[PDB]
Amino acid sequence: DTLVVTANRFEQPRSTVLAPTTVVTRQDIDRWQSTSVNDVLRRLPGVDITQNGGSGQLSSIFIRGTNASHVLVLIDGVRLNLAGVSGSADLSQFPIALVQRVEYIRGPRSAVYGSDAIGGVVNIITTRDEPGTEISAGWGSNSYQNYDVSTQQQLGDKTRVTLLGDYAHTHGGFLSKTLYGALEHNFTDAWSGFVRGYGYDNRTNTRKLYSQSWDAGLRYNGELIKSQLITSYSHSKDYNYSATLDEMKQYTVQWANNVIVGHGSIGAGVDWQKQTTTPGTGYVEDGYDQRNTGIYLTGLQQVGDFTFEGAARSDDNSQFGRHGTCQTSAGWEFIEGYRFIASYGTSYKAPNLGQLYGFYGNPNLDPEKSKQWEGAFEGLTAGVNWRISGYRNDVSDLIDYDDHTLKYYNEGKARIKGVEATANFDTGPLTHTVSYDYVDARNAITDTPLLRRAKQQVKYQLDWQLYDFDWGITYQYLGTRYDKDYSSYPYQTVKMGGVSLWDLAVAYPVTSHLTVRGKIANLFDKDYETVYGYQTAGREYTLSGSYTF
């Protein structure tokens, strides 16, 4: 199988991770011709993305019916800094040109990573191993324009340098400029070090976002033992124009180890994080300094037809103190190629600055808490790889605005019951990748459905190659959703009808160096919204190329 590092921080085959797992490579992203992260993500199981319009507009990610703030987004294994002020991940500003791989694991994972990993985890990896220089560019609808240069070069054997530059610009709009460098060095065959730095300057209509991140690390990859020590600094500055500045610095230091033992592994690590915000950030008066340290244990073992996986973690947070989480999954391969999996896991979400210290702050709030149970069957039948999972997620201690006392409190519960079905198979030269999600996400106290969430989704990718034309068709059904209408007070909840959407993409190797690509997004120009009142794109055309040398 393809490897992931996201389940326990170290490489393992994805057949040994029991939680459902999706991997997107750069090759997929080039064929899809995605011009944003959201477009990559909306394609995958359990993902419901809403957006205040097109590219660059604020967005929310609802994994498996959970709140916007209950997905953990990592960049190269570190909590996305853009999410630090608001406490909820928004990838609409993150440059797609940095995205080399996505590992997405559904279900909880606080027991490895701490806060936010309730619905699942999305790790965006920016590292590639692909020697050479490449030039790319695109033109499309709304004066869309992209230029991109990158290279990877040995500087002597043992060392290599990566550089990337990207400019993307789209009127009505959204402008984004990105720069990335890395140095990778192999001290021995087992020992390695790296320093990575990147930044992007975005403008959106007037919002002005700038972010930089620097990472530095040491890894040991032995025959049995693996170790990693990584430090990370991020600094973002977010201007809105009267005058609002949100600024945050995030520091991380993590040390993990993992050893192969019996038929599997055992791991442990320690994780430290500091976030400082500047006065006035998040409509909070003072600057804050929040700290967290966690310690966790992981395990995986195969015995006969059974697989057991687990993680357990204790976090010590400077505001709410101590919270412990744990996860266990057992799988049973009862006949060759078929498997039942049962999982249980707790996870949490930390209070955010606004909830804590804003005008309606409550400095004594506790984390939001999740308990999740999941059961799955997977199999390989007649060339079809498939899986069907049912899950229940009880969330409690939700942080809610109390209008009577003008303060946030822990109160309030949600019950989510869902089914995920996926399959992939070929029929002659055709490859089919399909998924179906049912999500019944409610307020558990009133029994009413949560807003902003599609109860059902169907997703289908159909790929094939005919001459030297490589074709991809993308279909999605976004089901019924409820939302509030803010044009009239009191704001009333409205029912937004299901919608089907189609994209067509093609690529062609003009020569061995030159690939040209075309896309039509929203082929039937379907008029729809994912947030009530905010119009989405309509039919758009892209045309691009890349040249390798």
Ligand X SMILES: *SCC1=CC(C)(C)N(O)C1(C)C
67 is in an annotated binding site: yes
Q: Which is nearer to ligand X, 119 or 472 (CB)?
A: 119
Q: Give me the phi and psi of 28, to 5 degrees please.
A: -65, -45
CB of 187 or CB of 338, closer to ligand C8E: 338
Span between the terminal Cα atoms of the chain, in Å: 30
Q: Which is nearer to ligand X, 194 or 348 (CB)?
A: 348
Residue 380 known to bind ligand? no
Minimum distance, C-beta of residue 8 to ligand C8E, in the bound complex (Å)? 10
* Member of 191, 344, 475, 528 binding ligand X (CB under 6 A): 344
Contact call for residues 495 and 508 (beta carbons, < 8 A): no
Checking 162-166 for CB contacts under 8 A at 24+ apart, the result is 162/127, 162/128, 164/97, 164/98, 166/95, 166/97
CB distance 99 to 37 below 8 Å:
yes
Least distance in angstroms from the C-beta of 175 to Mg ion: 8
The 3 state secondary structure assigned to 379-435 is EEECCEEEEEEEEEEEEECCEEEECCCCEEEECCCEEEEEEEEEEEEEECCEEEEEE
58 annotated to a ligand binding site: yes
Is residue 314 at the binding interface for ligand X, with CB under 6 A as the rule? Answer: no
3-class DSSP string for 143-187: CEEEEEEEEEEECCCCEEEEEEEEEEEECCCEEEEEEEEEEEEEC
Q: Which is nearer to Mg ion, 157 or 223 (CB)?
A: 223
> DSSP secondary structure string, 181-224?
EEEEEESSSSEEEEEEEEEEEEEE--EEEEEEEEEEEEEEE-SS
Tell whether residue 328 is a contact of ligand X (CB under 6 A). yes
Shorter beta-carbon distance to Mg ion: residue 13 or 222: 222
Selected from 269, 345, 351, 379, the binder of ligand X by CB under 6 A is: 345
* Residues 493, 419: Cα–Cα separation, whole Å: 25
> Is 221 assigned a ligand-binding role in the annotation?
no
- 8 A C-beta contact, residue 26 and residue 272: no
Rg (CA), the chain: 23
Annotation-wise, does 360 bind a ligand?
no
Q: Which does 344 bind (CB under 5 to 8 A by kind): ligand C8E, Mg ion, ligand X, none?
A: ligand X
Contacted by 308, from Mg ion, ligand C8E, ligand X, none: CB < 5 to 8 Å by type? ligand C8E
Residue 25 is a binding residue for ligand X (CB under 6 A): no
User: Is 60 annotated among the ligand-binding residues?
Assistant: yes
85 in Cβ contact with 353 (< 8 Å): yes
- Site residues (vs ligand C8E, CB under 6 A): 261-262, 266, 268, 295-299, 301, 308-314, 324-326, 328, 335, 338, 375-377, 379, 386, 388-392, 417-419, 421-423, 434, 436
Q: How far is the CB of 178 from ligand C8E (least distance, A)?
A: 37
Q: Which of 17, 24, 122, 326 binds ligand X (CB under 6 A)?
A: 326
- Annotated ligand binding at 244? The verdict is yes
Span interacting with Mg ion, options 52-60, 88-96, 366-374, 407-415, rule CB under 5 A: 366-374
Residues 515-544 that bind ligand X (CB under 6 A): none
Q: What span, in angstroms and rounded, lies between the C-alpha atoms of 407 and 319?
A: 17
Find the binding residues for Mg ion in span 208-227 (CB under 5 A).
222-225
In the complex, which residues of this chain contact ligand X (CB under 6 A)? 326-328, 344-346
Residue ranges for the binding site? 58, 60, 67, 85-86, 244, 452, 486
Residue ranges for the binding site for cyanocob(III)alamin? 58, 60, 67, 85-86, 244, 452, 486
